[PDB]
Design a protein around this ligand. Structure first.
Ligand SMILES: *[C@@H]1O[C@H](CO)[C@@H](O)[C@H](O)[C@H]1NC(C)=O
Lengths: 48, 50
Protein backbone atom coordinates (compact mmCIF):
# COMPACT_ATOMS: atom_id res chain seq x y z
CA UNK A 1 0.00 0.00 0.00
CA UNK A 2 1.28 3.41 -1.07
CA UNK A 3 0.06 5.97 1.46
CA UNK A 4 0.12 9.59 0.28
CA UNK A 5 -0.49 12.31 2.87
CA UNK A 6 -0.89 15.91 1.76
CA UNK A 7 -1.26 19.41 3.14
CA UNK A 8 -1.48 22.70 1.25
CA UNK A 9 -0.22 25.81 3.02
CA UNK A 10 -0.29 29.51 2.02
CA UNK A 11 3.14 30.98 2.83
CA UNK A 12 5.05 34.15 2.02
CA UNK A 13 8.62 33.21 2.97
CA UNK A 14 11.34 33.68 0.38
CA UNK A 15 14.03 31.02 0.60
CA UNK A 16 13.79 28.36 3.31
CA UNK A 17 11.25 26.23 5.15
CA UNK A 18 8.91 28.38 7.28
CA UNK A 19 8.98 27.66 10.99
CA UNK A 20 5.64 26.40 12.25
CA UNK A 21 3.50 23.31 12.57
CA UNK A 22 0.99 21.79 10.13
CA UNK A 23 -0.29 18.21 10.31
CA UNK A 24 -0.61 16.43 6.95
CA UNK A 25 -4.00 14.89 6.10
CA UNK A 26 -4.13 11.58 4.17
CA UNK A 27 -4.78 12.09 0.45
CA UNK A 28 -4.96 8.64 -1.20
CA UNK A 29 -4.07 4.99 -0.55
CA UNK A 30 -2.83 3.07 -3.59
CA UNK A 31 -2.59 -0.79 -3.73
CA UNK A 32 0.47 -0.86 -5.98
CA UNK A 33 2.31 -3.86 -4.45
CA UNK A 34 5.70 -3.05 -5.98
CA UNK A 35 9.25 -2.76 -4.70
CA UNK A 36 10.41 0.86 -4.29
CA UNK A 37 13.95 1.82 -3.28
CA UNK A 38 14.66 4.86 -5.50
CA UNK A 39 12.58 7.86 -6.50
CA UNK A 40 12.66 10.84 -8.86
CA UNK A 41 11.26 14.36 -8.78
CA UNK A 42 9.60 15.54 -12.00
CA UNK A 43 10.05 19.17 -13.04
CA UNK A 44 8.86 21.26 -15.99
CA UNK A 45 11.01 23.27 -18.38
CA UNK A 46 10.22 26.76 -19.64
CA UNK A 47 10.98 27.40 -23.31
CA UNK A 48 11.08 30.68 -25.22
CA UNK B 1 -17.78 -3.63 13.97
CA UNK B 2 -20.15 -4.80 16.71
CA UNK B 3 -21.33 -3.07 19.87
CA UNK B 4 -24.22 -1.77 21.92
CA UNK B 5 -25.23 1.84 22.47
CA UNK B 6 -27.58 4.67 21.60
CA UNK B 7 -26.95 6.32 18.24
CA UNK B 8 -27.51 10.08 18.35
CA UNK B 9 -26.77 13.16 16.27
CA UNK B 10 -23.37 14.73 16.83
CA UNK B 11 -21.50 18.00 16.49
CA UNK B 12 -17.99 16.55 16.11
CA UNK B 13 -16.41 18.01 12.97
CA UNK B 14 -14.88 14.89 11.46
CA UNK B 15 -12.39 15.41 8.66
CA UNK B 16 -13.20 13.72 5.25
CA UNK B 17 -10.77 10.81 5.77
CA UNK B 18 -12.00 10.24 9.35
CA UNK B 19 -14.55 7.45 9.76
CA UNK B 20 -14.80 6.42 13.41
CA UNK B 21 -13.69 7.72 16.78
CA UNK B 22 -12.06 6.12 19.78
CA UNK B 23 -11.97 6.90 23.50
CA UNK B 24 -9.11 6.35 25.97
CA UNK B 25 -10.21 2.71 26.49
CA UNK B 26 -10.09 2.32 22.62
CA UNK B 27 -13.79 1.46 22.49
CA UNK B 28 -15.51 3.05 19.50
CA UNK B 29 -17.37 6.25 20.46
CA UNK B 30 -18.57 7.51 17.05
CA UNK B 31 -18.99 5.88 13.65
CA UNK B 32 -19.68 6.95 10.08
CA UNK B 33 -22.49 4.99 8.52
CA UNK B 34 -21.97 3.53 5.02
CA UNK B 35 -24.32 4.35 2.09
CA UNK B 36 -25.31 7.75 3.57
CA UNK B 37 -21.84 8.88 4.90
CA UNK B 38 -23.34 10.63 7.97
CA UNK B 39 -21.50 10.63 11.33
CA UNK B 40 -23.34 8.87 14.17
CA UNK B 41 -22.23 9.27 17.79
CA UNK B 42 -22.22 6.11 19.93
CA UNK B 43 -23.16 6.68 23.57
CA UNK B 44 -23.24 3.64 25.93
CA UNK B 45 -26.69 2.76 27.25
CA UNK B 46 -27.49 3.92 30.81
CA UNK B 47 -26.33 1.60 33.59
CA UNK B 48 -25.54 1.60 37.28
CA UNK B 49 -25.70 -0.13 40.61
CA UNK B 50 -28.86 -1.32 42.36
C1 LIG C 1 -23.84 3.42 -1.67
O1 LIG C 1 -22.61 3.62 -0.95
C2 LIG C 1 -21.73 4.58 -1.56
C3 LIG C 1 -20.46 4.59 -0.73
O2 LIG C 1 -19.61 3.51 -1.08
C4 LIG C 1 -22.42 5.94 -1.64
O3 LIG C 1 -21.57 6.84 -2.35
C5 LIG C 1 -23.76 5.83 -2.36
O4 LIG C 1 -24.45 7.07 -2.29
C6 LIG C 1 -24.62 4.73 -1.73
N1 LIG C 1 -25.86 4.56 -2.48
C7 LIG C 1 -27.04 4.28 -1.91
C8 LIG C 1 -28.20 4.13 -2.84
O5 LIG C 1 -27.16 4.14 -0.70
Amino acid sequence: YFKIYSKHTPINLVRDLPQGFSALEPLVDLPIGINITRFQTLLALHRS
Amino acid sequence: LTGTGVLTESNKKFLPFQQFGRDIADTTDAVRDPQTLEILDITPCSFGGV
